[PDB]
JSON list of C-alpha atoms in Angstrom, two decimals:
[
{"chain": "A", "resi": 1, "resn": "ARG", "atom": "CA", "xyz": [-9.29, -34.03, 3.61]},
{"chain": "A", "resi": 2, "resn": "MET", "atom": "CA", "xyz": [-9.31, -31.98, 6.79]},
{"chain": "A", "resi": 3, "resn": "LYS", "atom": "CA", "xyz": [-5.83, -30.79, 5.81]},
{"chain": "A", "resi": 4, "resn": "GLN", "atom": "CA", "xyz": [-6.96, -29.99, 2.27]},
{"chain": "A", "resi": 5, "resn": "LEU", "atom": "CA", "xyz": [-9.82, -27.83, 3.55]},
{"chain": "A", "resi": 6, "resn": "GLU", "atom": "CA", "xyz": [-7.43, -26.10, 5.96]},
{"chain": "A", "resi": 7, "resn": "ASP", "atom": "CA", "xyz": [-4.95, -25.37, 3.16]},
{"chain": "A", "resi": 8, "resn": "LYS", "atom": "CA", "xyz": [-7.73, -23.96, 0.97]},
{"chain": "A", "resi": 9, "resn": "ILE", "atom": "CA", "xyz": [-8.91, -21.67, 3.78]},
{"chain": "A", "resi": 10, "resn": "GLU", "atom": "CA", "xyz": [-5.36, -20.36, 4.16]},
{"chain": "A", "resi": 11, "resn": "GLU", "atom": "CA", "xyz": [-5.11, -20.01, 0.37]},
{"chain": "A", "resi": 12, "resn": "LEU", "atom": "CA", "xyz": [-8.41, -18.12, 0.06]},
{"chain": "A", "resi": 13, "resn": "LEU", "atom": "CA", "xyz": [-7.53, -15.85, 2.99]},
{"chain": "A", "resi": 14, "resn": "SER", "atom": "CA", "xyz": [-4.28, -14.87, 1.27]},
{"chain": "A", "resi": 15, "resn": "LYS", "atom": "CA", "xyz": [-6.12, -14.25, -2.01]},
{"chain": "A", "resi": 16, "resn": "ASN", "atom": "CA", "xyz": [-8.72, -12.09, -0.27]},
{"chain": "A", "resi": 17, "resn": "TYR", "atom": "CA", "xyz": [-5.96, -10.04, 1.39]},
{"chain": "A", "resi": 18, "resn": "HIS", "atom": "CA", "xyz": [-4.38, -9.52, -2.03]},
{"chain": "A", "resi": 19, "resn": "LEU", "atom": "CA", "xyz": [-7.71, -8.37, -3.47]},
{"chain": "A", "resi": 20, "resn": "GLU", "atom": "CA", "xyz": [-8.18, -6.01, -0.53]},
{"chain": "A", "resi": 21, "resn": "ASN", "atom": "CA", "xyz": [-4.71, -4.62, -1.28]},
{"chain": "A", "resi": 22, "resn": "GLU", "atom": "CA", "xyz": [-5.76, -4.28, -4.92]},
{"chain": "A", "resi": 23, "resn": "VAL", "atom": "CA", "xyz": [-8.92, -2.38, -4.00]},
{"chain": "A", "resi": 24, "resn": "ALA", "atom": "CA", "xyz": [-6.79, -0.02, -1.92]},
{"chain": "A", "resi": 25, "resn": "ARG", "atom": "CA", "xyz": [-4.21, 0.39, -4.71]},
{"chain": "A", "resi": 26, "resn": "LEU", "atom": "CA", "xyz": [-6.98, 1.07, -7.22]},
{"chain": "A", "resi": 27, "resn": "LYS", "atom": "CA", "xyz": [-8.78, 3.50, -4.89]},
{"chain": "A", "resi": 28, "resn": "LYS", "atom": "CA", "xyz": [-5.55, 5.44, -4.45]},
{"chain": "A", "resi": 29, "resn": "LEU", "atom": "CA", "xyz": [-5.22, 5.84, -8.22]},
{"chain": "A", "resi": 30, "resn": "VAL", "atom": "CA", "xyz": [-8.76, 7.30, -8.35]},
{"chain": "B", "resi": 1, "resn": "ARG", "atom": "CA", "xyz": [-15.36, -29.93, 12.20]},
{"chain": "B", "resi": 2, "resn": "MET", "atom": "CA", "xyz": [-15.57, -30.67, 8.45]},
{"chain": "B", "resi": 3, "resn": "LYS", "atom": "CA", "xyz": [-18.75, -28.62, 8.43]},
{"chain": "B", "resi": 4, "resn": "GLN", "atom": "CA", "xyz": [-16.94, -25.70, 10.10]},
{"chain": "B", "resi": 5, "resn": "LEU", "atom": "CA", "xyz": [-14.07, -25.73, 7.59]},
{"chain": "B", "resi": 6, "resn": "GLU", "atom": "CA", "xyz": [-16.44, -26.03, 4.64]},
{"chain": "B", "resi": 7, "resn": "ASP", "atom": "CA", "xyz": [-18.50, -23.10, 5.94]},
{"chain": "B", "resi": 8, "resn": "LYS", "atom": "CA", "xyz": [-15.32, -21.03, 6.19]},
{"chain": "B", "resi": 9, "resn": "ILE", "atom": "CA", "xyz": [-14.40, -21.80, 2.59]},
{"chain": "B", "resi": 10, "resn": "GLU", "atom": "CA", "xyz": [-17.86, -20.88, 1.34]},
{"chain": "B", "resi": 11, "resn": "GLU", "atom": "CA", "xyz": [-17.66, -17.67, 3.39]},
{"chain": "B", "resi": 12, "resn": "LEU", "atom": "CA", "xyz": [-14.21, -16.69, 2.10]},
{"chain": "B", "resi": 13, "resn": "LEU", "atom": "CA", "xyz": [-15.06, -17.65, -1.50]},
{"chain": "B", "resi": 14, "resn": "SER", "atom": "CA", "xyz": [-18.11, -15.38, -1.41]},
{"chain": "B", "resi": 15, "resn": "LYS", "atom": "CA", "xyz": [-15.97, -12.55, -0.03]},
{"chain": "B", "resi": 16, "resn": "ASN", "atom": "CA", "xyz": [-13.45, -13.28, -2.78]},
{"chain": "B", "resi": 17, "resn": "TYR", "atom": "CA", "xyz": [-16.06, -12.92, -5.51]},
{"chain": "B", "resi": 18, "resn": "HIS", "atom": "CA", "xyz": [-17.33, -9.63, -4.07]},
{"chain": "B", "resi": 19, "resn": "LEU", "atom": "CA", "xyz": [-13.76, -8.29, -3.98]},
{"chain": "B", "resi": 20, "resn": "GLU", "atom": "CA", "xyz": [-13.14, -9.49, -7.55]},
{"chain": "B", "resi": 21, "resn": "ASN", "atom": "CA", "xyz": [-16.30, -7.74, -8.73]},
{"chain": "B", "resi": 22, "resn": "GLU", "atom": "CA", "xyz": [-15.18, -4.50, -7.06]},
{"chain": "B", "resi": 23, "resn": "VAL", "atom": "CA", "xyz": [-11.62, -4.71, -8.43]},
{"chain": "B", "resi": 24, "resn": "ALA", "atom": "CA", "xyz": [-13.08, -5.25, -11.90]},
{"chain": "B", "resi": 25, "resn": "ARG", "atom": "CA", "xyz": [-15.23, -2.14, -11.58]},
{"chain": "B", "resi": 26, "resn": "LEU", "atom": "CA", "xyz": [-12.34, 0.01, -10.32]},
{"chain": "B", "resi": 27, "resn": "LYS", "atom": "CA", "xyz": [-9.96, -1.20, -13.03]},
{"chain": "B", "resi": 28, "resn": "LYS", "atom": "CA", "xyz": [-12.44, 0.09, -15.62]},
{"chain": "B", "resi": 29, "resn": "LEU", "atom": "CA", "xyz": [-12.94, 3.43, -13.86]},
{"chain": "B", "resi": 30, "resn": "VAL", "atom": "CA", "xyz": [-9.23, 4.21, -13.64]},
{"chain": "B", "resi": 31, "resn": "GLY", "atom": "CA", "xyz": [-8.83, 2.73, -17.10]},
{"chain": "B", "resi": 32, "resn": "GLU", "atom": "CA", "xyz": [-6.45, -0.05, -16.13]},
{"chain": "B", "resi": 33, "resn": "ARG", "atom": "CA", "xyz": [-7.32, -3.51, -17.46]}
]
């Protein structure tokens, strides 16, 4: 379960980075 | 250690939702989706 939590942290971190990229992409449009 | 990992998930998930909310607002402004 330790490994599952670790994988989810890595997964969420990647998702957050994507969303941060998206914010930047969307800002640039503006 | 479980507690630490779980706290990290709850932290990142909250950050995720705040970013999603912002992306949603910006998409509307620029008239994306």
